[PDB]
Symmetry: C5
Subunit: 45 residues, 5 copies
């Protein structure tokens, strides 16, 4: 058999998954940042 | 020995692990977002 | 020389590191969740 | 080179995506560390 | 043979970045765990 076609599909799937991770990570950084700023302006601190 | 069969298996394992990482990241962003909001409504702040 | 063997080795090392990442992230979510619950019970909030 | 060219392009895209993830994680750690300090140094605690 | 030299190079760069990510995550969970303990002991809570 020729496994090249399947290997290419696996690599493409890896990039698809990586794009999802990157998207999630950038949103996560935004949430943590909001949380940080909120704690900084917390009068009780 | 042709190594394509083994390489394909490695690629498949990579994607399976990525699937898990993506799922964990999704659940994590949810917890953080919940924490963010919980703090924005903290009495002593 | 044939680089196929070395390519397979790189893929195997990648999966090892990715496995460690999966485990670390799994523990991290638990820590964040515990953190979330602790804040939800913070009397000052 | 049959599918070789396409496979190399996928690998290049993966490395680029990884670089971004790495940069995002670097920023996230500083935010979390800045938060860890802000708390460790909160009066009411 | 094949674009093997080029593909191997991309795989080596990917591993280098992944090892860095692993180390970043390791340090990050440490900081989060520290944050968790600090809150658990926050008398204001
Ligand atoms: C970035 C992220 C998002 C990802 C991780 O879960 C870690 C994290 C935590 C935010 C937290 C954790 C516990 C302590 C914090 C910093 C709260 C303070 C303890 C509130 C001080 C309250 C007081 C005023 C009465 O003494 C506000 C937000 C809380
Ligand atoms: C920053 C953080 C730390 C905080 C969150 O957990 C999210 C995160 C993830 C890092 C990851 C997740 C899955 C995908 C990545 C980006 C790996 C790649 C899939 C490896 C491509 C491998 C290959 C070689 C076969 O083509 C390397 C590091 C991995």
């Amino acid at each position: 058999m020729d496994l090249a076609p399947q290997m290419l599909r696996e690599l493409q799937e890896t990039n698809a998954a990586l794009q999802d991770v990157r998207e999630l990570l950038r949103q996560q950084v935004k949430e943590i940042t909001f949380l940080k700023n909120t704690v900084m302006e917390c009068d009780a601190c």
